[PDB]
Write a protein that binds this DNA or RNA. Structure first.
Lengths: 114, 141, 127, 218, 41
RNA sequence: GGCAAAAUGACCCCGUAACUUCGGGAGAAGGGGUGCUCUCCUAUCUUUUGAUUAGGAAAGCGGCACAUACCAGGGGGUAGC
RNA sequence: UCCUUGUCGCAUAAGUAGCGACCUGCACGAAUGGUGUAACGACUGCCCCGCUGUCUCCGACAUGGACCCGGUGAAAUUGAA
RNA sequence: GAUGACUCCCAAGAGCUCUUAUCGACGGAGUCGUUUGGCACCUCGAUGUCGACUCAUCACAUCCUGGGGUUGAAGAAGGUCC
RNA sequence: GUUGGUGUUAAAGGGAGAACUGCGAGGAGCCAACCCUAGUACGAGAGGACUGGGUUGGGCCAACCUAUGGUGUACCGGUUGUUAUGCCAAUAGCAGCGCCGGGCAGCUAAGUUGGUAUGGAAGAACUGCUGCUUAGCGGGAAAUCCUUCUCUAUACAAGUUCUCGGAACAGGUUUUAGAACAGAACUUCGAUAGGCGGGAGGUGGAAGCACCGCGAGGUGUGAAGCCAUCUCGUACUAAACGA
């Protein structure tokens, strides 16, 4: 016992992360979102109030840092190319379901970035 | 954490020779703040003697060198710590003398014939338990 | 950062094709996505409303600068593109009024927050 | 912010001394993300009530943390023992009004702070060592393709026979930056827990990755 | 140019402090600062 | 003052402007190809036994990337001398 | 070519520059050569392309000194302070 | 301190009426030491010269912000002045 | 900027550890747009208020990396040339990480925060009213001085409180702190660092084995395999001390 204060504070952090992680996996839907998937989902934005009901494009990378966990999608929508980043346990994402897998060698598929 | 002030290739290619000599011989006398560094490669090369598989052997083939200290590890250091869980070197501070004020240090293994600080007995670890955060110890007096 | 010297694409259907920044009316480094820039047309169809070598305003719609919404989300297009607005040569009443007829190319809906609802309404589909 | 906590119309209530645990990211009901800091209050208690009557000034001596007799240096073992007060990791005094005066030996906690209102922290910040200008003060620097032995240094004081070699109190490269710097008029406390006595704050609280912060303004 | 006064003043505060606690191998001969490996027993 | 730094670079193939003293500009500019695997035919090769090494066909196979590291031209337009 | 940033045009968001032209040449001029010229220049000027910390606005990282201990151990200068 | 900048004096005339809102001709009054300068006192057994970068600092005879007077100040833009 | 000595009545030879107070010094004082009140006063409309509240931005400053970027030279994987381990296998050295694609903690800003205040006094022209011809007071400016923030008792009228007296040091393992010094943590009735186990966190399908194909190569065994960091267990190592 009596570990150093910094050690105990980092412990508090790693704890109080999974606390809220479970506290949202008790009510939300998520898939496994391995890179190389092709994902579909929805986002209501707090600016307009709009909810586009769908977006689509390959998933290029993610960081499973915890409650914060970003991932990026190479949505080429009627334009040069649009790369998006979403935190996974958002209050917005709801339909994060449609996947279609691949076989990727790299882990962060960046080389697709032109 | 130490750089020792050496290009990171030459630094390794020295530390390898040092751990390898620490296994060929049984004791060495070296500058302390570098003994404090072989303090890690020696143990991570004892763990491979303890595992001994083909994988974890062909890996040690890279980290140790000079002679067949490879076999020395695999054959005697395993069998002499098949039980000792962690902590396989002593790193005493002899500060004998140099002409450069550089400290000096005996570093050598544990359960030999003539060690330096006659050791404690190799006790198997107890198994893990769940950590808790009561913070209930007032420590008043 | 879209700043002096940048060379970004016109993406409405006015005369000019390529427009070269000279300013950022509300920045000190370059102007991030969604902010009026001043710039000088560099090439046009011979018949549009704008002729090469003429300072004209503009609003940003695509910028390789990543930008995050307030939602923690982040987006970054590929190239730099802007849409024109008539210069201040018309009064403050017409602030934030476009020139062309239809932009084409995805658009971020931070233009709303930035009060560019005029160009917004014409948008193909807001990212 | 008034009519809360525990006092009369107008005073300063005592401050509470906590530990910077780290940062994370919450959300609101309107679906927006705010960074978060968790300040851990380690069962802070009163250890000396300072007195204009006897000593001269109005101060509550809050102790924080936990310590052990093998860790204290006897001159403070004696203090704690004479007070008869459980051992703490660091002491800290606050000046507070005549009212808001506590009994020796009353522990404090985060429910002292009503949510939704603000605080002022004071955290001995994260120095960086014997830095130099261009980071210590955001000075510019001469170009990197024309000038020699200056690419990263500074200028020269005003100087000539007038202001005779008298560099006024200027700005030079200097030692480290660890000090106590308030974040005045913080933004409202999101939430504080009945048990576990934490508290989340909108963010940017000074101090280390632990071991240092104070709180007041309430 | 600068004389004994300043020279002494500068070399002084760089004075040698007698070393604190110092222990000897009770019978094994040598003397040493603490935390050394003089001997064995 | 694009000083420096960057970049281009190799081999093979495609194609190559003004100008002219008709020799040149010209590596003008501007592009593509470059890995390995087996097979086929071609040459060639006496280093014997028929295969081996290179070229060029055409089908795969892997990598973001195949002169992968080292080596290796920035180019164009126009004055003055 | 002082007046001189002459004038006009080209070009640039803007060009005391660059190029073309005007002759109002303080003070061009035909072997102290006049005008032009393909090729050529570690020659001066301008423009464009690609490339980039030169820059907005700098950041992290590597080694060597700078720092610190044990050695050895100079140097300008020096009215005295 | 001549020229210099500024202030102040007077007030022909302009300001449709009006000298003084705003100016203001002739002629004077002073303040400062910033352009042009005059003198050659310190330095020629040495006081490194323009411009730029960095770094600022002071004065206020004020460009904005800050207050008020006044206006040929309806409001708004101004003007001028403290 | 960082420190060591010293002075400071005192009681222990007088030596200290904390905790303040803060004589006084520094720091911070920005502005726009937009909406409202309000098409209101004014004006024939044209036009367009005064003021106070509210928002949205820029600059400036202080702080924080949880996210995003950049890096991350003792990590993971791909990969070329060569030399070695006889060869296959799997590795190593070297090419100033050999070159690529990744990369946590740390650091930084392109990111994020947070400030650009209130209250109080004195009081500028400027304004008023009394006066009683001498004078009286009140408004009265982003201005001055106090309140916030910082620094401070060598503040020589040298301040006050608690406590220690084998007390404070010193040394050793580190450090969220760091050029040495300093601070802070730990010093065996112990988590101070290493080590070992468990996760997290990064790379991204280990070898051997089995299959498919002549091969390049592919698939299964298999989120396999490893590990720079982070947490968590355990005194196995090195931090007691008999000067």
């Amino acid at each position: 016992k009596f570990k150093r204060l910094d050690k105990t504070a980092k412990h508090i952090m790693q704890i109080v992360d999974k606390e809220a992680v479970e506290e949202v996996r008790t009510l939300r839907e998520i898939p496994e979102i391995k890179p190389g998937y092709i994902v579909q989902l929805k986002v209501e934005v707090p600016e307009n109030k709009r909810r586009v009901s769908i977006v689509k494009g390959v998933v290029i990378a993610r960081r499973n840092a915890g409650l914060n966990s970003t991932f990026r999608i190479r949505r080429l929508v009627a334009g040069v190319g649009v790369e998006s980043m979403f935190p996974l346990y958002s209050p917005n994402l709801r339909v994060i379901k449609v996947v279609d897998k691949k076989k990727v060698r790299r882990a962060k598929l960046y080389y697709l970035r032109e | 954490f130490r750089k020792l002030g050496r290009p990171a290739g030459h630094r390794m290619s020295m530390l390898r020779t040092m751990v390898s000599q620490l296994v060929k011989h049984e004791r060495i006398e070296t500058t302390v703040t570098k003994a404090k560094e072989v303090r890690r490669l020696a143990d991570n090369m004892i763990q491979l003697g303890k595992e001994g598989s083909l994988s974890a052997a062909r890996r040690a083939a890279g980290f140790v060198r000079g002679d067949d200290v490879l076999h020395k590890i695999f054959t005697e250091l395993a069998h002499r710590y098949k039980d000792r869980a962690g902590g396989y070197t002593r790193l005493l501070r002899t500060r004998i003398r140099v002409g450069d004020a550089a400290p000096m240090a005996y570093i050598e293994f544990i359960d030999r014939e003539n060690e330096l600080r006659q050791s404690k007995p190799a006790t198997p670890q107890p198994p893990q338990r769940v950590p808790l955060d009561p913070w209930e110890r007032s420590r008043l007096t | 950062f879209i700043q002096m010297g940048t060379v970004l694409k016109v993406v409405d259907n006015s005369g000019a094709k390529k427009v070269m920044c000279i300013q950022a009316l509300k920045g000190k480094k370059g102007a991030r996505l969604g902010d009026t820039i001043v710039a000088s047309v560099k090439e046009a169809m011979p018949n549009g409303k704008v002729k090469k070598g003429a300072v004209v305003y503009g609003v940003v719609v695509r910028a390789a600068m990543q930008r995050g919404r307030v939602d923690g989300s982040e987006v970054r297009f590929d190239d730099n593109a802007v849409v024109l607005v008539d210069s201040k040569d018309k009064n403050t009443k017409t602030d934030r009024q476009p020139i062309g007829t239809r932009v084409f190319g995805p658009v971020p809906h931070e233009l709303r927050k930035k009060k560019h609802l005029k160009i917004l309404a014409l948008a193909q589909h807001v990212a | 912010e008034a009519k809360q906590g525990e006092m009369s119309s107008r005073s300063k209530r005592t401050g509470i001394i906590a530990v910077k645990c780290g940062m994370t990211a919450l959300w609101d009901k309107w679906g927006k993300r705010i960074p978060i800091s968790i300040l851990w209050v380690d069962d802070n208690i009163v250890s000396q009530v300072k007195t204009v009557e006897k000593e001269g000034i109005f101060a509550l001596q809050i102790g924080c943390g936990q310590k052990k007799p093998k860790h204290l240096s006897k001159a403070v073992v004696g203090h704690f023992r004479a007070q008869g007060v459980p051992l703490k990791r660091k002491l800290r005094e606050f000046p507070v009004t005549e009212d808001a005066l506590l009994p020796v030996g009353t522990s404090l906690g985060v429910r002292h702070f009503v949510p939704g209102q603000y605080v002022d922290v004071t955290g001995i910040t994260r120095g960086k060592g014997f830095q130099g200008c261009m980071k210590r003060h955001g000075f510019s620097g001469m170009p990197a393709s024309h000038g020699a032995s200056l690419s990263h240094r500074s200028g020269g004081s005003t100087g000539q026979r007038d202001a005779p070699g008298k560099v006024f109190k200027g700005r030079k490269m200097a030692g480290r930056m660890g000090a106590d710097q308030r974040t005045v008029k913080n933004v409202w406390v999101y939430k504080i827990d009945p048990a576990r006595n934490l508290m989340w704050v909108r963010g940017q609280v000074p101090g280390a990755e632990g071991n240092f912060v104070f709180i007041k303004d309430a | 140019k600068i004389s004994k006064h300043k020279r002494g003043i500068r070399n002084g505060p760089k004075a040698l402090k007698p070393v604190p606690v110092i222990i000897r191998c009770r019978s094994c001969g040598r003397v040493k600062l603490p935390h050394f490996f003089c001997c064995s027993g």
